[PDB]
Amino acid sequence: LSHVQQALAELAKPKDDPTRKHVCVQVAPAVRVAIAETLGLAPGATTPKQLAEGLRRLGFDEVFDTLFGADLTIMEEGSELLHRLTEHLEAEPLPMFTSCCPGWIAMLEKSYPDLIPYVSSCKSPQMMLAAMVKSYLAEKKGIAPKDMVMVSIMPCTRKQSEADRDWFCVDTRQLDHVITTVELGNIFKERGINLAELPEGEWDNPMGVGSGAGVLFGTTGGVMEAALRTAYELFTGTPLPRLSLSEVRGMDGIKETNITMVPAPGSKFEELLKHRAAGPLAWDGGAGFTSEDGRGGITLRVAVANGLGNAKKLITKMQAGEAKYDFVEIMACPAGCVGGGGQPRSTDKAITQKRQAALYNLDEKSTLRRSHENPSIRELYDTYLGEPLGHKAHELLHTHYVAGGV
């Protein structure tokens, strides 16, 4: 039976059933926006509350959002990034690649197993939250990990294989079932439940306490952006706004961005570039700059690759030493994450932009919020995690790759 069907089996069992376990589900914002199309509506018509209300009525016990898991990823990946930078200034190498996309990791495991140490060891948002709920939440609520079943709604089919990774176990799964937008939307229609006719429900807090999804009001700008932001703000001491990715002439689908990082006055980072100055991909040393006064800095070269067929033409440019970058994010979708194979198919060649724009409201877009300001995240990183890249973090928040694929 399909993993989706397996979820429906447990859901069919009564809440007070002796063999019924706790079925928690985590949805992604990219799904919440396109889920409306599955009902024949406009992208973004369905509210996050309506979705949660519908899911809870499907038989689920706890409804969480991937945003909470992403908040953790931003912290871990950001810390690993900062680590890679600081260590290079002191004298895991560079460049550093983002690991969220399951399509990208498969390529570095089967096609380019020489870039393994170049990619982050941090796990994906959903895989982080799934591990967190089956541990911290399990212990806090007082439930055995075997009595907890978790489902996730992802806009990509490749996400199931991601959660199907052998070593992704607890302490036989961190994530048991993954359902796509198209499938979820069909289930709603099959049961006769229209999300457009549902009231404003509510989300569950992965912390076990408090009302809400555990996410504060405000966008992060994305995993890569928020990670870079966290590192930048700690390295420079100055706030970082939204990054405007510009397309690279010669490479379609490839966007780059240069971030001028200046060491904060009175920090170890400032002393690094003052006390000293001077793999298949050998770091060029970083694009640095200085002034005639003695104070300079370094500009971080970030690049985003959209598509697996785009990575092939990008890596070859880096191997030749033509395209010099420090941080590169590789996506397995045509544009962002709102255009995965698990997403609905409407008559529009540019339906991706609509979903991307309807991802957040005008207020949410204007209100910037980082993961290091989240009380829930702060608490988790205190009562259970202890510190980023720590023991527990390396256990459930980090992972490894396999040379040859899974």
Query: By CB under 6 A, is residue 155 in contact with ligand SF4?
Result: yes
Interaction between residue 332 and ligand SF4 (CB under 6 A): yes
Total chain residues near ligand SF4 (CB under 6 A):
14
Query: Which residues sit in the known binding site for [4Fe-4S] cluster?
Result: 101, 156, 333, 337
Q: Which of residues 346-385 bind ligand SF4 (CB under 6 A)?
A: none
Chain contacts with other proteins (rule: CB under 8 A)? 103, 106-107, 110-111, 157, 161, 252-253, 306-313, 332-335, 339-341, 345, 349-352
How near is the Cβ of 169 to ligand SF4 at its closest, in Å? Answer: 21
CB closer to ligand SF4, 56 vs 158: 158
Residue with Cβ nearer other proteins (118 or 136)? 118
The residue from 74, 85, 333, 397 that contacts ligand SF4 (CB under 6 A) is 333
Least Å from the CB of residue 163 to other proteins = 15
Instruction: Tell me whether strands 62-65 and 96-97 are parallel, antiparallel or unpaired.
Output: unpaired
Which CB sits closer to ligand SF4, 34 or 63?
A: 34
Binding site: which residues?
Answer: 101, 156, 333, 337
Nearer to ligand SF4, 56 or 159 (CB): 159
Binding at 223: pick from other proteins, ligand SF4, none (beta carbon under 5-8 Å per type): none
311 binds ligand SF4 per the rule CB under 6 A: no
Ranked by CB distance to ligand SF4, the top (closest) residue is 337
Query: Measured from the CB of residue 332, what is the shortest distance to other proteins in angstroms?
Result: 7
Report if residue 32 touches ligand SF4, rule: CB under 6 A.
no
- Are 152 and 179 spatial neighbours (Cβ–Cβ below 8 Å)? yes
165 binds ligand SF4 (CB under 6 A): no
Cβ 160 to other proteins shortest distance, Å: 11
Secondary structure (H, E, C), the chain: CCHHHHHHHHHHCCCCCCCCCEEEEEECHHHHHHCCHHHCCCCCCCCHHHHHHHHHHCCCCEEEEHHHHHHHHHHHHHHHHHHHHHHHHHCCCCCEECCCCHHHHHHHHHCCCCCHHHECCECCHHHHHHHHHHHHHHHHHCCCHHHEEEEEECCCCHHHHHHCCCCCCCCCCCCCEEECHHHHHHHHHHHCCCHHHCCCCCCCCCCCCCCCCCCCCCECCCHHHHHHHHHHHHHHCCCCCCCCCEEECCEEEEEEEEEEECCCCCCHHHHHHHHCCCCCCCCCCCEEEECCCCCEEEEEEEEEEECHHHHHHHHHHHHCCCCCCCEEEEECCCCCCCCCCCCCCCCCCCHHHHHHHCCCCHHHHHCECCHHHCHHHHHHHHHCCCCCCCHHHHHHHECCCCCCCC
Binds 161, which of ligand SF4, other proteins, none (CB < 5 to 8 A, cut-off by type)?
other proteins
Residue 263 Cβ vs ligand SF4, minimum distance, rounded to whole Å? 33
Partner that binds at residue 159, options ligand SF4, other proteins, none, CB closer than 5 to 8 Å by kind: ligand SF4
Kindly tell me which residue out of 27, 179, 331, 396 binds ligand SF4, with binding defined by CB under 6 A: 331
Contact (CB, 8 A) for 303 and 254: yes
| Nearer to ligand SF4 among residue 63 and residue 331 (C-beta) | 331
Q: Does 158 bind ligand SF4 (CB under 6 A)?
A: yes
Binding site for ligand SF4 (CB under 6 A): 100-103, 154-156, 158-159, 331-333, 337, 340
